[PDB]
Amino acid sequence: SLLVKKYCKMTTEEIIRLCNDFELPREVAYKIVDEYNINASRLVCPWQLVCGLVLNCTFIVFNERRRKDPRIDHFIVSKMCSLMLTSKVDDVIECVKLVKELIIGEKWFRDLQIRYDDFDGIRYDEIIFRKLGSMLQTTNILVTDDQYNIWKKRIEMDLA
DNA sequence: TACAGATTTTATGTTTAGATCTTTTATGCTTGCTTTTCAAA
Numbered sequence: 001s002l003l004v005k006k007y008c009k010m011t012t013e014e015i016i017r018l019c020n021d022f023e024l025p026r027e028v029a030y031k032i033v034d035e036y037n038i039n040a041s042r043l044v045c046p047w048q049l050v051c052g053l054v055l056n057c058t059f060i061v062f063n064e065r066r067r068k069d070p071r072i073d074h075f076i077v078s079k080m081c082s083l084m085l086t087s088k089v090d091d092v093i094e095c096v097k098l099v100k101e102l103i104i105g106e107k108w109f110r111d112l113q114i115r116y117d118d119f120d121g122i123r124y125d126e127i128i129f130r131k132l133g134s135m136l137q138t139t140n141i142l143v144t145d146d147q148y149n150i151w152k153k154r155i156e157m158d159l160a
Numbered sequence: 161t162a163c164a165g166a167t168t169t170t171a172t173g174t175t176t177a178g179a180t181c182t183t184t185t186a187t188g189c190t191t192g193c194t195t196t197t198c199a200a201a
Contacts, residue, residue, distance in 0.1 A: 007199070044199085 002047045002084040022058045052099020063118040
């Protein structure tokens, strides 16, 4: 288990290797590098911080693919347990929640949230009406128009 | 204007809501010594 190993040694090359197996953009990868570098002397297990950083960035960058396909959300963490050498998935989401405290309110995290238009899993135009307590907020008990359209196209493909 | 009746004026008592100051006690800061877990060899 890579999350158990205390005071371990790592370089930026391993960080780029982890960030290139998730196909993140390069600026986000160097911001992950800088975020590890400004905390590197004070982590009991730096792989905990790195795991939370890449998981929180890969939730944000592919928010549209996660919206149109939830199984990607069941893929990515299921892939990353293969890289942290852990069988249970609870420590990975614990890493996500523990790192989430340390980067919320940071300027680059907020700019990433703005430019991908992703604030805790939804766009601004939905979160403003859930914050206002609107009765007309787009609740999710039906399916969206894009999901309905791609499902209708897929079922018309498999009909003939 | 005459006068009964209503309202005001002046005068005081009853009860509650709150302000200020005094006395005693809690509380936090400082400084010097002692124990204890965790980062590193």
